[PDB]
Amino acid sequence: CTMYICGDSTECSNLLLQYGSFCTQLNRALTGIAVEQDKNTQEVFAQVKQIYKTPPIKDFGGFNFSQILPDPSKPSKRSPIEDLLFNKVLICAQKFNGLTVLPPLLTDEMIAQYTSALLAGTITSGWTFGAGPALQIPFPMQMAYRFNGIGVTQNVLYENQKLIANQFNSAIGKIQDSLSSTPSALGKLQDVVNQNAQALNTLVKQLSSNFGAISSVLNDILSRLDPPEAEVQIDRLITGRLQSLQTYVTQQLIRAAEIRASANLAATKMSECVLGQSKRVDFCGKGYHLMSFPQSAPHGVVFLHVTYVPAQEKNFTTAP
Amino acid sequence: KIQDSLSSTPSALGKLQDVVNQNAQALNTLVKQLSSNFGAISSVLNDILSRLDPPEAEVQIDRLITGRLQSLQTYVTQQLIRAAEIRASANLAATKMSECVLGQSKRVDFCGKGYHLMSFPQSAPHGVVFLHVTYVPAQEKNFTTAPAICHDGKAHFPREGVFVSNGTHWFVTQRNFYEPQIITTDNTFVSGNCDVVIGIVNNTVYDP
Amino acid sequence: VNFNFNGLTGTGVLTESNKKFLPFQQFGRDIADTTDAVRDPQTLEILDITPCSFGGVSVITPGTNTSNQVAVLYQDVNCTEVPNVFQTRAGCLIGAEHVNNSYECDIPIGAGICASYQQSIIAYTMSLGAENSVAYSNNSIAIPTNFTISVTTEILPVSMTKTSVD
Ligand SMILES: *[C@@H]1O[C@H](CO)[C@@H](O[C@@H]2O[C@H](CO)[C@@H](O)[C@H](O)[C@H]2NC(C)=O)[C@H](O)[C@H]1NC(C)=O
Ligand SMILES: *[C@@H]1O[C@H](CO)[C@@H](O)[C@H](O)[C@H]1NC(C)=O
Ligand SMILES: *[C@@H]1O[C@H](CO)[C@@H](O)[C@H](O)[C@H]1NC(C)=O
Ligand SMILES: *[C@@H]1O[C@H](CO)[C@@H](O)[C@H](O)[C@H]1NC(C)=O
Ligand SMILES: *[C@@H]1O[C@H](CO)[C@@H](O)[C@H](O)[C@H]1NC(C)=O
Ligand SMILES: *[C@@H]1O[C@H](CO)[C@@H](O)[C@H](O)[C@H]1NC(C)=O
Ligand SMILES: *[C@@H]1O[C@H](CO)[C@@H](O)[C@H](O)[C@H]1NC(C)=O
């Protein structure tokens, strides 16, 4: 704030000091927000202590995971869909008033490594990697456990393993095409990016407001007036800029609280949908839960939920 | 181990200590704001009223009112947001109490890391501590597996477990604990034949 | 420098501009509606005006219970304008020795860099955990022999002191 309210002015800074700590409890709140965001990130992604890897020979049932598992040829070891998601989804001017942006602690490459480890774990170990040492299990047998979990006997899977693999493959292709086609699919992340861009653009634009002063430019006020008049005009500017900064911080605290709630939902879904198999209806997608796959996204997470859905109808008479 | 870990590591209760510290800082900051002038000639209300007559005193007091009221509004807003986060935490703690203590949960990593057996509540200053008892697999041992057994040309599938590759001796065992049992018609079921399933090992089955 | 261009005052660094000013335009403004360009009043040259390099200072330190040695992070400021110098994404980190060996994050720096006291203060790229290649095949299952029971402690805040401000 000492730059946002009294930028490059010792006299203004000395006048601001007459308002005590309002300037330091706002910066403390924003520091807490940055720390909170890093905490949200590791609660969502750092749930596996080991980075698991797939074998060189990706024989995983005739089920094609090449789309969600990392591709080595592309630099960033992201999946094709993840690369698609990242491709689909002032700082000097802001900085000059002291409102800088800090880098995330975890870069996209480490987020990709966490999603790669979690997906590789799910594929090669089912839910066992999430409750202790990872057991290996064949993917078809893992599918058998998930079918038993949803109340379907193992024989439906083994007798129809080829159709299940083919249906899975097309569903994956459908996800790739749906995300590639529909721009609005990632609206949930784009609205957050837009809200923060608008919050910063509004806060910065408030510096062009007079707030009752003869001029919005601090250098012009100090260049035109002497202390007996400059103190009143600067005090007027201090009141307006401090109120605008307090409004900004309050808006960031409420938006952060909603983001915190979303992060708790995302972490709960990660643990219950990815690191296990849920029996909670409509929590992890629409249908009977089989498995889920995490995917990295800009400032967020994308879940691919695999569900069992009844199709054709046939009537029968019953009896108790 | 829990007793020793809590006795040894001071930072273990950081989640409650940070809340206590945040409230102590919020109150200390709010109280310290009373030493601020807010543009008045003096921060002391008794000194303002003792040195200035009511016509001017009104302007200096109005200046003090604006600063102190803005600081109090900031404090209350901070308490409402912090309280909202505490409310969310209380809902999580109550949900964990009901689902982890008053029952047995099948939700992975909700009530501790592992397979939930039971949980125990413990009282703590302005909070709750849960002792979650979990089952965790330890030693590793490798086995070869197979999706089905072909006995008389029919495909036999297990009702509960996974087949173990002794070498000479396919057995069925519960999924989370090695306990091999003889393959019988009492622990398998028959559906379809061995001609469609990928990987059947055609081992021999017994009819006790 | 501190400049005064025909009444326009501020502090900053003057560089050559590539903006195509029209013959009548004397200065420019950014999206923020603050001055960011000026036409010199004596030679009709176009200059871009930016402020002088600045940034926050963060002190990276183990606690005073262990050591009084510290490292200082100048956030998003290049090593050259700052006056064991280590350049990273967050900026120039001076006083921490960079080592390739990865460890658990102790003091986070940002963009994958963490710091710890190991004695001296070191800076490193963080480890994400030990690697474990799973022995996957189409016909292999692992099953626990002796099993263990673990007790995990979970601590949650429930309430805060009930203040009342008349
Ligand atoms: C499983 O592990 C436990 C150790 O965690 C073993 O228990 C030990 O058994 C020996 C005698 O065989 C005792 O002298 C030790 O005091 C025991 N230690 C503990 C902590 O229980 C146990 O023998 C192992 N069992 C199997 C099935 O291998
Ligand atoms: C998986 O999909 C990719 C798409 O390019 C294809 O090239 C590949 O042959 C498919 N099969 C497997 C199992 O890799
Ligand atoms: C499995 O059993 C069938 C029926 O007896 C037989 O035709 C087939 O050759 C067997 N395969 C083996 C020996 O694995
Ligand atoms: C297999 O079964 C035989 C039959 O006695 C038993 O002796 C042996 O321990 C079992 N395990 C292996 C590896 O063969
Ligand atoms: C005076 O200003 C004019 C432009 O108005 C410029 O062409 C000339 O060179 C300047 N002369 C001096 C004394 O610098
Ligand atoms: C810092 O300055 C040096 C020397 O000009 C340059 O080589 C380096 O790329 C700069 N780094 C950044 C972060 O701009
Ligand atoms: C770290 O790796 C780089 C690149 O190989 C090398 O230049 C540098 O000397 C290494 N430093 C250490 C601490 O070994």
**Cα separation, A4 vs A143, whole angstroms:** 57
For strands C131-133 and A51-53, give the pairing. parallel
**Cα separation, C78 vs C76, whole angstroms:** 7
> Cβ of A254 under 8 Å from any chain B Cβ?
yes
- Which residues from A are below 8 Å from B197, CB to CB? 158-159, 161
Q: Which residues lie across from B170 on neighbouring strands?
A: B165
Helices and strands, counts by H and E, chain B: 4, 8
CB contact under 8 A, A250 and B155: no
**Cα separation, C11 vs B116, whole angstroms:** 63
Q: Which of A219, A220, A271, A296 to mutate to test the interface with C (most CBs of C within 10 A)?
A: A219
Q: What subunits touch chain B, counting only 3 or more CB pairs under 8 A?
A: A, C
**Cα separation, C106 vs C108, whole angstroms:** 6
CB contact under 8 A, A109 and C112: yes
The protein residue with its alpha carbon nearest to ligand 4, atom 1, reads B166
- Which residues from A are below 8 Å from B143, CB to CB? none
The protein residue with its alpha carbon nearest to ligand 7, atom 13, reads C99
In 3D space, the residue among B207, B197, B117 whose CA is nearest the CA of residue B157 turns out to be B197
Question: Which DSSP category does C127 fall into?
Answer: P
How far out from the chain centre does Cα B180 lie? 35
CB contact under 8 A, A19 and B38: yes
Q: Which residue of C has its CA nearest to B109?
A: C152
Test site for ligand 7: of C97, C100, C120, C124, most ligand atoms within 8 A of the Cβ: C100
**What are the start-end ranges of the E strands in C7-146?**
8-11, 13-16, 27-29, 35-39, 46-50, 57-60, 71-75, 85-88, 91-94, 97-98, 107-110, 113-117, 121-125, 131-133, 140-142
- B74 CB neighbour count, 10 Å cutoff: 21
Q: What is the CA radius of gyration of chain A?
A: 27
Q: Which residue of B has its CA nearest to A254?
A: B81
The residues, ordered by sequence, that sit 6+ positions from B103 with a Cβ below 8 Å of its Cβ are none
**Cβ proximity of A260 and A41 under 8 Å:** no
CB contact under 8 A, C158 and B113: no
In 3D space, the residue among B189, B106, B104 whose CA is nearest the CA of residue B151 turns out to be B189
Please tell me the number of Cα atoms within 13 Å of B112 on its side-chain side.
Answer: 28
Alpha helices, DSSP H, located in B37-173: 45-51, 54-96
Q: What is the SS3 assignment for B144?
A: strand
Q: What is the SS3 assignment for C51?
A: coil
Q: Which residues lie across from A52 on neighbouring strands?
A: C132
Torsion of CA C98, C99, C101, C103, to 10 degrees: -40
Whether B73 lines ligand 3, by a CB cut-off of 6 Å, is no
Burial class (CB in 10 A: 0-12, 13-18, 19+), B115: buried
Q: How far is the CA of C121 from the centre of ligand 6 (A)?
A: 25
What method was applied to determine this entry? Answer: cryo-EM
Resolution in angstroms, to 1 decimal, for this deposition? 3.5
The two three-digit tokens of residue B10, written as one number: 């001071």
CB contact under 8 A, A103 and C89: yes
Whether A64 lines ligand 2, by a CB cut-off of 6 Å, is yes
Burial class (CB in 10 A: 0-12, 13-18, 19+), B204: exposed
Q: How far is the CA of A122 from the centre of ligand 2 (A)?
A: 20
